């Protein structure tokens, strides 16, 4: 007599859940997540912005890192997201409860976030998290300005429909640094061709490769740092080997073309 | 047989003309003038702002200090002024020629600057400099925003009709710092009572004391640093003894009341 299976928790490599101290990227930009998941704090005279939070259990760690940086819960003004999967948007609901932060996201990301990542086009209910509501819906190319830092949304659908690259200009050693936080361009276990839930998946990915290639991009960061060749545990050399946006897009496209061939064969 | 006198150059204490390296005031704000004359550089992702230039001969020194800070001539976007006397606006014409900078000033300051400080209400033609044109006229309370730093004009007529306090918020050790660059509140050799060229001089000064007292003012700076108890040659302790805006206003008012009594007696 065989019962139905137990629910399976979304488990991940230890490095994804390994806390790290804040790592400075530019004068007002810091990595405050874990060794293998990005969560970017951008510190402004008019309050702080967080781009991604990582996994659901990273909430208190993020708040601790913010505190270390001189950012109290009420100082957090905005949360922005690369995409609404559990390993990047996971703590967003809790962050909203515990801080003054409002979430801006595109329509697709907002809808997936509000579902807590359930009914995912590819994952189903395999990888879910506490749902959260967006406070503001953003359009492609729309800018949001916080204490003088201008964040621009660049839609790059594929990994999720609502996948977004966020760009802004910070400063370092006296000069401006155009940072590109480009979303994932992977398709882990995705049915790419003739997917009834995403009929134009392939065409969106191709447009997203071109979008990522063309971003203003002195420094590239990615939700999974390894994808842009970042090593957050490497301290002063964390970003030394980082890819350009062009190289990141090219690598993603070559990998995607291989996955297409393997799927056709499969 | 006695000829007319030679023109007298406007000569000043050596300390007013003594170059100093850039002295940091806050994260994006630096003193870049001389030991005894203020010239503030505020560095922005969207270019730099200069508040005052000091004496006419400080132009190249200022440009050198800007270079040291990573600001090239074309990076200087805006010049703002406390007041248009030779020892604060002196190099402005040359700075405009040698950089991309445009000048914003109120109507009174613009008119005095365009005259190169000639026909001064109190000094006549004693203290003059190369004339310069304003590119933008500002009104009381008007804000100008450069790469996210918001500068607000607070008119404080008296020392000159167009005397202005400029306020902005920078950051330091993680926290915001509300900087007040308050203009001079002195009246050196001025006829205060029944001055036909400035009939409401006394009333303007009194209103200006109240204005200066009420400014947003975590840190006060003044065109002559001694007036706010700054010692730019004191390095890490330059600003330690700095007055509050309230104390500066109170001191100025007590001094002014004394000058009124002495004039009545005189
Ligand atoms: C590393 C892998 N990521 C995941 O499986 C979690 C959702 S992005 C990928 O995007 O290929
Ligand atoms: C120090 C003295 N300044 C000058 O004589 C030059 C014009 S502000 C003052 O304002 O009292
Ligand atoms: Zn994902
Ligand atoms: Zn992920
Ligand atoms: Zn003066
Ligand atoms: Zn002066």
- Are residues B170 and B177 in contact, defined by beta-carbon separation less than 8 angstroms? yes
Closest listed residue to residue A223, CA positions, set A85, A94, A56: A85
The most distant pair of C-alpha atoms in chain B lies apart, rounded to whole Å, by 70
User: Can you give the residue ranges of every domain in chain A?
Assistant: 1-266
With both helix axes pointing from N to C terminus, report the angle between B245-265 and B201-214 in degrees, rounded to the nearest 10.
160
Looking at the DSSP assignment, which residues form a beta bridge with residue A169? A178
Q: Identify which of A182, A184, A187, A251 to mutate to test ligand 1's pocket (most ligand atoms within 8 A of the CB).
A: A184
Inter-chain contacts counted by CB atoms under 8 A, chains A and B: 34
From B16, B184, B228, give the residue whose CB has the most ligand 2 atoms within 8 Å, as the site to mutate.
Answer: B184
Residues sharing a CB contact under 8 Å with residue B1, sequence separation 6 or more, in sequence order: none
Measure the CA–CA gap between B104 and B140, rounded to whole angstroms: 12
Q: How far apart are CA B112 and CA B95, in angstroms?
A: 17
Tokens 């640094």 — which residue?
Answer: A177
Q: Is A71 helix (H, G, I), strand (E, B) or coil?
A: coil
Where do the DSSP E strands lie in B111-218?
Answer: 136-137, 143-146, 149-155, 164-172, 175-181
Chain B positions touching A71 (Cβ under 8 A) are 174
What is the Å distance from ligand 3's center to A127 Cα?
10
- Residue B197 exposed, middle or buried by CB count within 10 Å (0-12, 13-18, 19+): exposed
Breaks (C-N over 2.5 A) in chain A follow: none
CA atoms within 13 A on the CB side of B42: 25
User: Distance, CA B64 to ligand 2 centroid (Å)?
Assistant: 26
Separation of alpha carbons A132 and B215, rounded Å: 41
Burial A63-77 (b: 16+ CB within 10 A, else e): bebbeebebeeebbb
How far is C-alpha A224 from the chain's CA centre?
8
Residue A119's nearest CA partner among A161, A153, A80 is: A161
- Which residues of A are less than 8 Å from B147 in CB distance? 148
Instruction: Single out the residue of A78, A261, A258 nearest to residue A166, CA to CA.
Output: A78
Helix (H) / strand (E) element for A266: namely: none
Angle of the A245-265 helix axis to the A201-214 helix axis, nearest 10: 160
Measured in Å, residue B184 CA sits from the centre of ligand 2 at 8
Q: How was this one solved? A: X-ray
Any ligand 1 atom below 6 A from CB of A85: yes
Q: What class does CATH assign to B1-266? A: alpha beta
Count of C-beta atoms within a 10 Å radius of residue A255: 13
DSSP character at residue A120: B
Strand partners, A34: A19, A37
What is the chain A residue with the closest CA to B70? A174
Tell me if A154 is assigned to a ligand binding site. Answer: no
B148 chain-A contacts, CB cut-off 8 A: 44-45, 145, 147-149
Shortest Cα–Cα distance, B169 to chain A (Å): 7
């Amino acid at each position: 007599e065989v019962p139905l299976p137990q629910l399976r928790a979304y488990t991940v490599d230890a490095s994804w859940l390994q806390p790290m101290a804040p790592l400075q990227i530019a004068d007002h930009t810091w990595q405050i997540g874990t060794e293998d998941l990005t969560a970017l704090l951008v510190q402004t005279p008019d309050g702080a912005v967080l781009l991604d939070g990582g996994m659901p259990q990273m909430a208190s760690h993020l708040l601790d890192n913010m505190k270390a940086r001189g950012v109290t819960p009420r100082d957090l003004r905005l949360i922005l997201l690369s995409h609404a999967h559990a390993d990047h948007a996971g703590p967003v609901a809790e962050l909203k409860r515990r801080t003054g932060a409002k979430v801006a996201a595109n329509a697709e990301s907002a809808v997936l976030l509000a579902r807590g990542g359930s009914d995912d086009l590819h994952f189903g209910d395999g990888i879910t998290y506490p749902p959260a509501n967006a406070d503001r819906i953003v359009m492609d190319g729309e800018v949001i300005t916080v204490g003088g830092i201008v964040f621009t949304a660049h839609f790059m659908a594929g990994h999720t429909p609502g996948s977004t690259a966020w760009t802004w200009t910070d400063t370092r050693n006296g000069k401006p640094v155009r940072i590109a936080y480009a979303d994932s361009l992977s398709a882990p276990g995705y049915q790419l061709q003739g997917n009834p839930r995403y009929p134009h998946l392939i065409e969106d990915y191709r447009r997203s490769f071109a979008t990522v290639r063309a971003l203003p991009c002195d420094v590239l960061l990615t939700p999974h740092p390894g994808a842009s060749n970042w090593d957050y545990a490497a301290g002063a050399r964390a970003g030394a080997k980082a890819l350009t946006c062009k190289a990141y897009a090219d690598a993603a496209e070559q990998k995607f073309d291989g996955q297409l061939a393997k799927e056709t064969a499969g």
